[PDB]
């Protein structure tokens, strides 16, 4: 059976299971069941399933090199699908809540969930909450007597928290740390002294890399009972690296990719985002350019936003990007190499992820 076909089938099974359990154990009525079904489809379907499918692809890899009965192969593949869906639903949770937090308009060329006329922020905050509880209902039901249950839940829990800590670093990234105070409305930074590579790297690592890269790879290993074909410090380093690279590209596209293709009008300039472009720009600008940057950044006035774009184009950031890219390629290949010692299968799955990321 092809992997996508399995993964999509498992969605319909898990949806049926969750909705049926609401009826049999939570006294739900059909109209509310239908609301949550539509919620689930609208927030969880329609992407490329990179994160979910990685869990499946990692598991498929170990299946080729490990002796198993047929029924075990199926159980492993089914576990990989459910685990994959746990990450997609985790992602959907974060996307629903982030869009509300940020006052976002569109997501995947369609309106954000909270904007749907019969949803509203009042319901959508809680719909996002339910998405994440669904990930745990899946794990407890499907993996009830799996040996990996404890480790899986512990990992998931750590990644979730990292993500939320990351979101916090992200939403406060235009503030001066020394001014943060729940009592005092927060001004945007004037100096941009916290627009550094290290500070940037901290936001992306917590906000994105743990749930996008670390979680699917390690979940793959857990459902395959293969945590011992790898050096966990290595899997960490390579994920944080591929993950960083991922965010550099979406920081670049937020700026220089028409809103048609982005599936979203970019507002990193006007949100005064600590993006790779602003940081890298500030690491190479002369004094007159830094002053012009500061006079325009974080302003919706389209004219000021077109000034920030001008400065980035002028400053030749594509050269910095290709330099970054060359170094990331170096480091990723070296890490892949170090992964091949213990597992060529796992190293090949990390190679396949990095490819999809790069292209």
Ligand X SMILES: Cc1ccc(-c2noc(CNC(C)C)n2)cc1
Chain residues binding ligand X by CB under 6 A are: 50-51, 54, 212-213, 216, 246, 353, 356-357
Q: Measured from the CB of residue 317, what is the shortest distance to ligand X in angstroms?
A: 17
213 binds, among ligand X, its own copies, Zn ion, none (CB under 5 to 8 A by kind): ligand X
What does the DSSP assignment read for 320-336?
HHHHHHHHHHHHHHHHH
Q: Which stretches of the chain bind Zn ion, using CB under 5 A?
A: 98, 102, 250, 254
Q: Is 98 annotated as a binding residue?
A: yes
* C-alpha 52: how far from chain center: 11
Indicate the residue among 102 and 337 with the shorter CB distance to Zn ion: 102
Comparison of 118 and 258: residue with beta carbon closer to its own copies: 118
Q: Are 34 and 322 in contact (CB under 8 A)?
A: no
Nearer to Zn ion, 112 or 339 (CB): 112
**One of 55, 56, 86, 119 touching its own copies (CB under 8 A):** 119
The CA-based dihedral angle spanning residues 197, 200, 201, 207, taken in that order and rounded to the nearest 10 degrees: 180
Residue 122 exposed, middle or buried by CB count within 10 Å (0-12, 13-18, 19+): exposed
C-alpha dihedral over 210, 91, 45, 262, to 10 degrees? Answer: -80
Q: For residues 296 and 224, what is the distance between their CA atoms, to the nearest angstrom?
A: 51
Residue 50 CB, shortest distance to ligand X, in Å, is 4
**What does the per-residue mask of binding to its own copies show for 7-26, with x meaning CB under 8 A?**
---------------x---x
Q: Which is nearer to Zn ion, 151 or 250 (CB)?
A: 250
Q: State yes or no: 170 annotated in a binding site.
A: yes
> In DSSP terms, which residues pair with 110 in a beta bridge?
107
| Tokens read off for 35 | 């609301």
Q: Does residue 108 belong to the site contacting its own copies (CB under 8 A)?
A: no
Would you say 261 and 337 are in contact if contact means Cβ atoms under 8 Å apart? no
Cα–Cα distance for residue pair 73/94, rounded to 1 Å: 32
User: Is 268 annotated in some ligand binding site?
Assistant: yes
- Tell me how far apart the alpha carbons of residues 340 and 348 are, in angstroms, rounded to a whole number: 8
Residue 246 CB, nearest distance to its own copies (Å)? 19
Which of 4, 295 has the CB closer to ligand X? 4
- Residue 167 Cα to chain centre, angstroms: 11
216 binds, among Zn ion, ligand X, its own copies, none (CB under 5 to 8 A by kind): ligand X
Chain contacts with its own copies (rule: CB under 8 A) = 22, 26-29, 31-32, 34-36, 38-39, 42, 97, 100-102, 116-123, 125-127, 129-130, 133, 136-137, 140, 150, 153-154, 157, 160-162, 164-165, 167-169, 171-172, 177-186, 202, 205-206
């Amino acid at each position: 059976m092809a992997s996508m076909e399995r993964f999509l089938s498992v969605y319909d099974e898990v949806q049926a299971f969750l909705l049926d359990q609401l009826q049999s154990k939570y006294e739900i009525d059909p109209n509310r069941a239908r609301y949550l079904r539509i919620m689930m489809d609208t927030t969880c379907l329609g992407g490329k399933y990179f994160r979910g499918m990685t869990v499946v692809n990692v598991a498929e890899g170990f299946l080729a090199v490990t002796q198993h009965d047929e029924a075990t192969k199926e159980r492993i593949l089914h576990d990989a699908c459910v685990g994959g869906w746990m990450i997609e639903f985790l992602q959907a949770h974060y996307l629903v809540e982030d869009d509300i937090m940020d006052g976002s308009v569109m997501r995947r060329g369609k309106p954000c969930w909270y904007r749907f006329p019969g949803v509203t922020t009042q319901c959508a905050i809680n719909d996002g909450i339910i998405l994440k509880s669904w990930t745990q209902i899946m794990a407890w039901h499907y993996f009830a007597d799996r040996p990996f249950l404890k480790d899986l839940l512990c990992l998931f829990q750590k990644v979730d928290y990292a993500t939320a800590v990351g979101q916090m670093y992200d939403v406060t990234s235009m503030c001066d740390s020394n001014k943060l105070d729940p009592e005092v409305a927060q001004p945007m930074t004037t100096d941009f002294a916290e627009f550094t590579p290290a500070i940037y790297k901290r936001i992306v690592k917590y906000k994105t890399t743990f749930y996008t890269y670390l979680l699917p790879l390690v979940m793959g290993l857990l459902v395959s009972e293969a945590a011992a074909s790898v050096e966990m410090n290595l899997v960490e380093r390579v994920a944080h690296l591929i993950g960083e690279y991922f965010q550099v590209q979406d920081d670049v596209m937020d700026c220089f990719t028409p809103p048609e293709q982005l599936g979203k009008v970019g507002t990193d300039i006007e949100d005064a985002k600590c993006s790779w472009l602003a940081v890298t720009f500030l690491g190479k600008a002369n004094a007159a350019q830094v002053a012009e940057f500061k006079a325009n950044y974080g302003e919706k006035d389209p004219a000021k936003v077109a000034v920030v774009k001008r400065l980035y184009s002028k400053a030749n950031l594509q050269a910095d990007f290709a330099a970054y890219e060359a170094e990331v390629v170096r480091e990723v290949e070296s890490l892949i190499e170090q992964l091949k010692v213990k597992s060529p299968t796992f190293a090949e799955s990390v190679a396949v992820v990095w490819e999809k990321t790069h292209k």
